[PDB]
Design a protein around this nucleic acid. Structure first.
Lengths: 93, 107, 581, 86, 95, 93, 107, 87, 98
DNA sequence: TCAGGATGTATATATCTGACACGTGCCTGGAGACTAGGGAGTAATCCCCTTGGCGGTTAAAACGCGGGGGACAGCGCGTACGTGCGTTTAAGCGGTGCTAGAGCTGTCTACGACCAATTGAGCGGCCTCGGCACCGGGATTCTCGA
DNA sequence: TCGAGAATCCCGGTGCCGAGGCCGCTCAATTGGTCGTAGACAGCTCTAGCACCGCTTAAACGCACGTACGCGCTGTCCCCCGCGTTTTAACCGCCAAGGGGATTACTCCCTAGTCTCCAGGCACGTGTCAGATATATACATCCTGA
């Protein structure tokens, strides 16, 4: 009965990227488990990544090196630009 | 004491609180950070809008308003690094894009 | 007065060598004195200092203990070494066994002297391929040998022989390569088992850090092994200015010279042969240039102020402006030699005056390099000035080293500046022709005086020896000078030691010893660009050289010579290092 | 409620079907011995995935196998299926 | 008629162009039920799990015919045999 | 300065299996990291295995299904025999 | 109140307490069990004695008292399922056992 | 002149013909063509470039300038290359 | 007439001598300046222990041996003993690298 | 090169089917408030890790030439699945029940956290000495030709 | 069809440096007595899987038939195996600073812990429209023959 999904989140992303484009339920589910699994890799690898240095608390640098080490290629630079941009925007207020 | 979601302070979609508490109870680390779920929300914004944007371009190329997992596979494998990250993992209902070998076709 | 208690401590450990096979009286308690050289000695005569040095080694032979010959290179150490071999072979009729250890570069000298001096001693030499080494390897195991040659690198590979056999008297050479404590060659001697007696022989005294504690002050002598290992901290602080280093420490250092009386022997050539009339040691001080101006100090701001600041950002770019060649395409994008690329350095600028004048005055210059990247770049621009020269390096593979000298020593040869490194040649190079020496950068250890000067001061050069030491204003290699030269001149007491460690006329260790103790007041005086015409006067040896330089002056002083230097062309400042970091 | 036993429980995959399935792979020529070996490797892989699935469902103390157990079986099998949950 | 192999080209284009399901549902249904009866009795299967395993092994098996096709074209012989496919499952690290 | 390894454990295993057989340091290290990594798979997979059912505490059944699902083949039957034998021997006292 | 290690109650070698506390602080689960580290100790006994036993048989085959990582690789790859589990992971200094292809050798 | 360090045998060829020859002799293959050398050094440089990228990522995260052995153990362990005997 | 061997027999004796021995094959220092040189491109002043050099060197060493072994099986399956760029690029292609 | 056929396609349409959005109950994420312990920027501190070099010694590394044999096209031919053509036929398909257990909630504990006290167990420094590496040299074993 | 050269293990001793012990230390394992709490049964829904079950129909199979294709054979050369020879830079050893990983220790500090209080997303009806099957047609593309 009780289930959780991103749903309207990803839908609003679609509204702010391609307003005239629609999405089906199978697409919302495959992208749901997609972002859930990508998060499973980021946080899953960040766990042992923070465990190497015996650091108890996880911080933004642990996730930084985590996802930066996760996906190779130039995409990581955009991840740093947008990610650190949102970090500075959040801490700025 | 007006309640304002901190996810809206960064101007994002994916919530900081849900991924924050989910990361807490997810027994990944004994403690948690402050800006870490915000950075997670950010990379989810850029990746979700990334692959969703290529999917929108594929659906626009096929003259379809909605999107299809076929167009999802085409969008993934078309991009270089996006297919490089997803090359090991398979897909569901996506399929294989048409390809023809060099000498397989006759003269 | 901790050295006074060492007189009683030796009696217990002194009989380790004799029985098991006042420091004067304990050494002087047995009477054997023979001044006359052996009758079987053939091939020459022994000088008064060689006769006394013989009997001085016989004074060591009194109680048979170990000894040290610290004297200067060029006094015939081989003659004094082969003398004791043939002396003990006759008088005491022990006839052996004998073992010598000499470097391979000088082994050609030691192997050639077995003909003249001692024809009757059958020898053995290990060199070349292992098959040629195996030839005499099987012959010696049958018991055939008298004096056996060998080098340092084979000591670990000769473990087969030396482990099963046993010797009596071993002799070595190049005792200052032994200076590494943990070195395998030092550990192999303990693995070597032992023998009766030995003579540790070095060409130069202690160098680099605090005076030698490992071998001469521990490993060589029976009492001295474990004794000072506790005292090592007390005597190290000797080396709060006048009170320590002058007032009380005087006698403290004198007690260090008091214990070493029978042990070390060092005598300069000027006190025996004195064929060299005198030397001349000058200096020069230049200033910075375009790349070496505050941009230099600015280059320190980028990196710190890779790694190894002393090497990378300091020693490299202080002599030649651009190093590692990645920045070469910045200043000179064509990477092609043209006019005045080599004159943009401050240290290199001074040489534009001397090279034209030394050709007209007919002087031959010796050059010693560090940072071997400088060796090629020097020679490269040396093609632009178009003057003759000869090269050399450590990659010569020992072949051309002996061959190139006959081309250099030729009188009709116009080759002037002679390329060398400091560590190359092993001081056996035997060059008497060139009367001038120039050095770009300071060497840390005294060997700069104990190697480069031994090329000049050695027999065969009767002219004045000249030295030019380059330095720049407000630079890092400044403080190394005081550190290298001045701070390591504590060995000045050691070069003074051998003077009163010799026969030692009484007035030497008080009256004339204070003369060296008057040299520290000039250190504060020196602690407190110049002119091209100022160096012009000090480089001429006599009056007719002063007359020809004025004729050379009027030639180049009418025309402008651009300018003497070049300045930082303002764009390369901020453009250079911002794209590298 | 009832039981129906019919033959051909192994090779029931039909050569036109699996042949077209190979045609999706881009293969040009298909021999006659490819079908049997293909059902052999598919049979072994089937043993692996279903052994994993029954390990899950058996651990859950339930009599019903769910798609989640298949998503996890493939998960630790090296391929992550999406859209059905997990 | 048509020249041999051209119809195969048109087919391959028609299939690789379309994302629709290829193998038939119910034979796979009684396949999984039959092979599952050997292990444990009375297993309940949703259609979503049947689509899960069916599409999984379907696409992976397509990758097996594709890898086998590359081994065949490298073998200089277009025809696939048991040897190149057993070498495919051998290099894949299954057996 | 402070490091931990099984060491004398595995050595005593060698003494109770092959008394006349010796072991080197490289072998003790490769088997050290071997058993540490096998434990990393058992407990690592048992984590999410217990997370599927939302069970907070981990028990002997979680490790049972864990290692039983880890290594395929008949070896798992011996793992059940020896393992459950030690469980009954421990709980019997 | 005599202290008796509970690892000796099961007659094993690998300790229950060290793996128990290490599993606790290893942030794998929010809680821990009772017999779980005992079962871990058991499987470590049977696996360690397993591969160590095959290593002893290989060293005995090569007439060597001690064991070599070479003999470790031979023992691993010789067994079917043991090499099946370790087939993906590599080794250190172990190497590759001698093998000769069918038609590679001449007649 | 010859002072330029540009002229030299490049470092990617440090692995030589008899080196990789013996290596393939351990591999079991007999007859080797010409391009196996350059191509194998290409895959070598690419893969080792990825591995040193991972290593400098882990070590760079620790703020330490020293890449350790446990680092390589963690990178290879994450890739599936896990190397025992050290960690 | 001098002494020789039939072509390929020396290769057999070699392969037996190498596959029989566990000693290290590729040379340390070239791999040292290889890792230092390729590492200089990413980040400055990296410090490398010899244990890590043995780690990566033995890792890529043995894995590359497995690459020549897999390429050898693809070659013997190709009916041509000689290995070309094609079977090794098919080896790294089936391995899932590129 | 074009007549005569097998596969695609965009212009009405009309027609089932899922996606979207427009309001309602309801678990819930945040925003103040107050304790507590992980960590960081300090600072000594000793052992390896880096730069510039020398002096040698080899066992590999590179080059040149013979030559053995397989890659490598070219050709001949015996099949054999590819391509239709009927002929069954089991896959769907919607339309009927049936039910075993998934799931959800309620309740009473057996059971792991958790702190205070107690020590043998296992981890750092000596020590010593038998198994392993190495050099000969000789009894074959292996390979290749008369 | 077998009788001639190198290659390699088998002893036959010798150095040699870690492996096994052995001992001192010290601290995480072990024990005892609280103490809060998931979890282990127990009961209740109710639901989607599980079979018929008649009906329909594209799909599968047996059969004919027939050119591509791979299997075998056959000649040509050129490339790598294998000899020889130079040659040559890693491998040790050795110089001489300077600097970067780890241990105490301490005292400020930032995000768990918890407690109260509020607004946001998500399960649920809803009615309206984007898309898939059915259909006709000038146009797009491969085959067989000249």
């Amino acid at each position: 009965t009780r289930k959780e999904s991103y749903a309207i989140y990803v839908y609003k992303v679609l509204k702010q990227v391609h307003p005239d484009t629609g999405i089906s339920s199978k697409a919302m589910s495959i992208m749901n488990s997609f972002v859930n699994d990508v998060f499973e890799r980021i946080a899953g690898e960040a766990s042992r990544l923070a465990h190497y240095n015996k650091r108890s608390t996880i911080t933004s640098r642990e996730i930084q090196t985590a996802v930066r080490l996760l996906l190779p290629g130039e995409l990581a630079k955009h991840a740093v630009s947008e990610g650190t941009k949102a970090v500075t925007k959040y801490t700025s207020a | 004491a007006k309640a304002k979601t901190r996810s809206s302070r960064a101007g994002l979609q994916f919530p900081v609180g849900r991924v924050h508490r989910l990361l807490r109870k997810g027994n990944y680390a004994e403690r948690v950070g402050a800006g870490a779920p915000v950075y997670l929300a950010a990379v989810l914004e850029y990746l979700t809008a990334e692959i969703l944007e290529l999917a929108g371009n594929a659906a626009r190329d096929n003259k379809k308003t909605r999107i299809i997992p076929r167009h999802l596979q085409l969008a993934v494998r078309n991009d270089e690094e996006l297919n490089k990250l997803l090359g090991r993992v398979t897909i569901a209902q996506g399929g294989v894009l048409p390809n023809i070998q060099s000498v397989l076709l006759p003269k | 007065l901790l050295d006074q208690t060492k007189d009683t401590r030796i009696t217990h450990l002194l009989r380790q060598t004799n029985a098991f096979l006042d420091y004067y009286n304990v050494a002087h308690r047995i009477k054997e004195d023979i001044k006359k050289q052996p009758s079987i000695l053939v091939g020459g005569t022994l000088k008064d200092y060689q006769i006394k040095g013989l009997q001085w080694m016989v004074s060591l032979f009194n109680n048979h203990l170990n000894g040290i010959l610290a004297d200067e290179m060029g006094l015939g150490k081989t003659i004094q070494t082969i003398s004791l071999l043939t002396y003990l072979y006759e008088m005491k009729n022990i006839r052996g066994p004998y073992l010598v250890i000499v470097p391979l570069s000088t082994l050609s000298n030691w192997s050639s002297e077995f003909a003249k001096w001692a024809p009757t001693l059958r020898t053995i030499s290990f060199k070349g391929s292992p098959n040629e080494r195996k030839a005499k390897q099987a012959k010696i195991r049958a018991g055939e040998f008298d004096v056996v040659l060998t080098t340092f690198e084979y000591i670990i590979k000769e473990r087969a022989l030396l482990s099963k056999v046993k010797w009596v008297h071993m002799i070595i050479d190049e005792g200052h390569r032994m200076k590494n404590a943990q070195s395998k060659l030092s550990l192999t001697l303990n693995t070597h088992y032992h023998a009766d007696y030995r003579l540790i022989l070095t060409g130069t005294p202690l160098q680099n850090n605090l005076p030698e504690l490992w071998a001469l002050l521990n490993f060589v002598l029976p009492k001295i092994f474990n004794s000072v290992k506790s005292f090592d901290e007390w005597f190290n602080t000797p080396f709060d200015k006048i009170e320590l280093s002058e007032e009380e420490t005087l006698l403290v250092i004198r007690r260090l010279h008091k214990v070493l009386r029978p042990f070390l022997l060092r005598r300069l050539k000027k006190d025996v042969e004195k064929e060299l009339p005198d030397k001349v040691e000058k200096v020069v001080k230049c200033k910075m240039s375009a790349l070496q101006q505050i941009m230099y100090q600015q280059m320190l701001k980028y990196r710190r102020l890779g790694f190894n600041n002393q090497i990378m950002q300091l020693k490299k770019i202080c002599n030649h402006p651009f190093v590692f060649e990645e920045v070469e395409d910045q200043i000179n994008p064509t990477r092609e030699t043209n006019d005045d690329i080599w004159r943009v350095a401050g240290k290199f600028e001074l040489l534009d005056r001397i090279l034209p004048k030394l050709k007209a005055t007919g002087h031959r210059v010796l050059i010693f390099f560090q940072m071997t990247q400088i060796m090629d770049i020097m020679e490269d621009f040396l093609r632009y000035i178009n003057i003759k020269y000869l090269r050399l390096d450590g990659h010569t593979k020992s072949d051309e080293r002996s061959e190139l000298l006959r081309l250099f020593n030729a009188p009709d040869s116009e080759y002037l500046c002679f390329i060398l490194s400091t560590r190359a040649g092993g001081l056996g190079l035997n060059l008497q022709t060139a009367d001038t020496v120039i050095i770009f950068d300071t060497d840390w250890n005294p060997h700069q005086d104990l190697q480069a000067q031994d090329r000049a001061h050695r027999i065969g050069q009767k002219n004045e020896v000249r030295i030019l030491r380059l330095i720049t204003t407000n630079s890092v290699e400044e403080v190394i000078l005081e550190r290298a030269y001045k701070k390591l001149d504590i060995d000045g007491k050691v070069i003074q030691a051998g003077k009163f460690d010799n026969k030692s006329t009484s007035e030497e260790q008080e009256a004339l010893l204070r003369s060296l103790l008057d040299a520290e007041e000039e250190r504060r005086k020196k602690r407190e660009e110049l002119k091209d015409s100022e160096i012009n006067e000090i480089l001429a040896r006599n009056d007719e050289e002063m007359a020809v330089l004025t004729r050379m002056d009027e030639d180049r002083s009418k025309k402008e010579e651009k300018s003497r230097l070049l300045e930082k062309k303002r764009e390369e400042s901020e453009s250079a290092a911002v794209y590298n970091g | 409620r009832h039981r129906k036993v019919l033959r051909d429980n192994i090779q029931g995959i039909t050569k036109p079907a699996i042949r077209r399935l190979a045609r999706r792979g881009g293969v040009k020529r298909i021999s006659g011995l490819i079908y049997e070996e293909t059902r052999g490797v598919l049979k072994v892989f089937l043993e692996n995935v279903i052994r994993d699935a029954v390990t899950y469902t058996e651990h859950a103390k339930r009599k019903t196998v769910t798609a989640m157990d298949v998503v996890y079986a493939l998960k630790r099998q090296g391929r992550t299926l999406y859209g059905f949950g997990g | 008629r048509y020249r041999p192999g051209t119809v195969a080209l048109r087919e391959i284009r028609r299939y690789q162009k379309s994302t629709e399901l290829l193998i038939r549902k119910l034979p796979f249904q009684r396949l999984v039920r039959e092979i599952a009866q050997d292990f444990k009795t009375d297993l309940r299967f949703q259609s979503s799990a049947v689509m899960a395993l069916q599409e999984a092994s379907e696409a992976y098996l397509v990758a097996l015919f594709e890898d086998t096709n590359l081994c065949a074209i490298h073998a200089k012989r277009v025809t696939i045999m048991p040897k190149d496919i057993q070498l495919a499952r051998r290099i894949r690290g299954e057996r």
